[PDB]
Amino acid sequence: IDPFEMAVKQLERAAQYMDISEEALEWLKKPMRIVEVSVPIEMDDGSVKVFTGFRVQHNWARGPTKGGIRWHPAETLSTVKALATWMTWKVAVVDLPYGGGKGGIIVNPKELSEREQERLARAYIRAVYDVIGPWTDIPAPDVYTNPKIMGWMMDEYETIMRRKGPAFGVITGKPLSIGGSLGRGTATAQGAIFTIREAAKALGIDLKGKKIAVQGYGNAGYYTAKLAKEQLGMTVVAVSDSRGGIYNPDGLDPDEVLKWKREHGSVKDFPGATNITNEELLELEVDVLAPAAIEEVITEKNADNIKAKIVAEVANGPVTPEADDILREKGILQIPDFLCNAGGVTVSYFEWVQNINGYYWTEEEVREKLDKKMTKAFWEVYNTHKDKNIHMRDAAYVVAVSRVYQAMKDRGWVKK
Numbered sequence: 001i002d003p004f005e006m007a008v009k010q011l012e013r014a015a016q017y018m019d020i021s022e023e024a025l026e027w028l029k030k031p032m033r034i035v036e037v038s039v040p041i042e043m044d045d046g047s048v049k050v051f052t053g054f055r056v057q058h059n060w061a062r063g064p065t066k067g068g069i070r071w072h073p074a075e076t077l078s079t080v081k082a083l084a085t086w087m088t089w090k091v092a093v094v095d096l097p098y099g100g101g102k103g104g105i106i107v108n109p110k111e112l113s114e115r116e117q118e119r120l121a122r123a124y125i126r127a128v129y130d131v132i133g134p135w136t137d138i139p140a141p142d143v144y145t146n147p148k149i150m151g152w153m154m155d156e157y158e159t160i161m162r163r164k165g166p167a168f169g170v171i172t173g174k175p176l177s178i179g180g181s182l183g184r185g186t187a188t189a190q191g192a193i194f195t196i197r198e199a200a201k202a203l204g205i206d207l208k209g210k211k212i213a214v215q216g217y218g219n220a221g222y223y224t225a226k227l228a229k230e231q232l233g234m235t236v237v238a239v240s241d242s243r244g245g246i247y248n249p250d251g252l253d254p255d256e257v258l259k260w261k262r263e264h265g266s267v268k269d270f271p272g273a274t275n276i277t278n279e280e281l282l283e284l285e286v287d288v289l290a291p292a293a294i295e296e297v298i299t300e301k302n303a304d305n306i307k308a309k310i311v312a313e314v315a316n317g318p319v320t321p322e323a324d325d326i327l328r329e330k331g332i333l334q335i336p337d338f339l340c341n342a343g344g345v346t347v348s349y350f351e352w353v354q355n356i357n358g359y360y361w362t363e364e365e366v367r368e369k370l371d372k373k374m375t376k377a378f379w380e381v382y383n384t385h386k387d388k389n390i391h392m393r394d395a396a397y398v399v400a401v402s403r404v405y406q407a408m409k410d411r412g413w414v415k416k
C-alpha cells in the first residue's frame with residue numbers, strides 16, 4: 001500500500017541509475033512468496049484467540065531468505081512486504097548468501113503474558129513451518145520480539161522437524177545457552193563503528209580525538225557512542241534521547257550517561273553538561289554525526305545547517321531524501337542507513353553459519369569477520385559512489401540490486 005509502494009519507488013529510483021532489465025525490475029517489485037496464516041492460541045482464560053500472521057519472502061536468488069519477526073498491532077501486509085523487500089538489499093549490500101524476508105503477527109504483546117507469548121510464538125512456527133527452514137527462510141529478532149521468543153520458536157521448530165537437521169539455524173538471535181552468538185548485543189553499533197572508521201579513512205580525516213554527536217540513546221546509541229569512544233578515539237560531546245539531550249565539549253562518558261538515564265528515566269540534566277534539545281544536537285560542529293532514534297530526524301528544514309563531516313545513519317530512515325541531497329551538495333559524506341545498520345544482519349548470518357557448521361566462534365573471531373564484511377560492504381558502496389558520481393544511498397542500492405540481478409541471471413530466472 002503506502003510502505004510497499006515506497007519500497008517499489010526506491011527500487012525504481014535505484015534502477016534508473018543502473019543497467020537493469022525491465023523484466024528483472026518487475027520481478028523484483030513482486031515478492032516471491034507471501035504466506036498468510038491464522039495463528040491460533042489458547043488464551044489464559046481458556047478461550048481461543050486467532051491472530052493474523054504474515055511471512056513474506058521477497059527474494060531468494062542470492063540464497064535463503066533472512067528476515068525479522070515483528071509483533072505490532074498496526075502491522076499490515078504492506079509493511080511486511082516493504083520491509084522484506086528492504087532487507088533483501090540489506091543482505092545484498094554486505095555480500096551475504098541471503099534473501100530478504102519478514103515475519104509479523106497483528107498482535108498487542110503488551111497484554112500478552114509469558115505463557116501467551118510462548119504459545120503465540122509456537123503457534124506461529126506451527127503455521128509457517130512449511131515455508132521456512134534453515135536453508136529456506138531464517139527469522140530474526142525485531143521489535144517486540146526478544147531472544148526468549150526465539151528460544152521458544154527454535155524449540156517448536158526442532159520439535160516439528162524431529163531434529164532431522166540443524167534446527168539452531170532456522171532462526172537467529174537465539175539465547176547464548178542454546179545456539180546463541182557472541183557479539184549479538186553490540187552488533188549493529190559495532191558494525192556502524194567499523195563503517196565510521198572506514199568513512200573517515202576514505203574521506204582522508206583521522207579520528208584521533210575527534211568529535212562525534214549521537215542523537216538517540218537506546219541500546220544501539222549507547223553502544224555506538226561507547227565503542228566509538230573506546231576504539232576510534234572519539235570524544236563524544238553531545239547525546240540526546242527522546243526526552244532531551246546534553247552537551248559537553250570536554251567529552252562524555254557513555255557509561256555515566258547510561259547510568260544517569262537509568263537512574264532518572266532520561267539523560268536530562270546530566271552533571272557537567274548543558275541541557276540541549278535534539279534540534280540543537282543536529283546542527284552542532286562535530287566530525288561524525290549518528291542519528292539513533294525515530295525515523296526522519298533530519299529534514300529539509302534542518303539539512304543545510306548540518307556542520308558534521310560524516311553522517312552515520314545508525315537508525316533506520318533518519319534522513320529524508322532531499323535532505324540527503326542537501327548533505328551531498330554540502331560536501332558531507334554520508335552512510336546509508338541500511339548499509340550502516342548491517343552489523344545486526346551480518347552477525348545473524350554469522351550465527352547461522354555457526355549453527356550450520358556446528359562450530360561456535362569466539363567474540364574475537366566474530367569481531368574480525370564482521371570487520372571484514374563491513375569494510376568490504378562500505379568500500380564497495382563508496383567505490384560505486386565514486387565511479388558513478390551518485391549518492392550514498394544510490395550507490396548502496398546499485399550494489400545490492402546489481403548483486404541480486406546477477407544472482408537471478410545466474411539462476412536463469414531472468415534471461416535478459
Ligand SMILES: NC(=O)c1ccc[n+]([C@@H]2O[C@H](COP(=O)([O-])OP(=O)(O)OC[C@H]3O[C@@H](n4cnc5c(N)ncnc54)[C@H](OP(=O)(O)O)[C@@H]3O)[C@@H](O)[C@H]2O)c1
Binds near residue numbers: 068188345
Ligand atoms: N536486522 C535484523 O535482522 C536484526 C536481527 C537481530 C537484531 N536486530 C536488532 O537488535 C535488536 C534486538 O532486540 P532486543 O531484544 O535487543 O530489544 P530490547 O531493547 O532488548 O527489548 C527487550 C524487551 O523485553 C522486555 N524485557 C527486558 N527485560 C525483561 C525482564 N527481565 N522481564 C520481562 N521483560 C523484559 C522489555 O520490555 P519490558 O521491560 O516492558 O518487558 C523490552 O522492551 C532489535 O531492536 C533489532 O533492531 C536486528
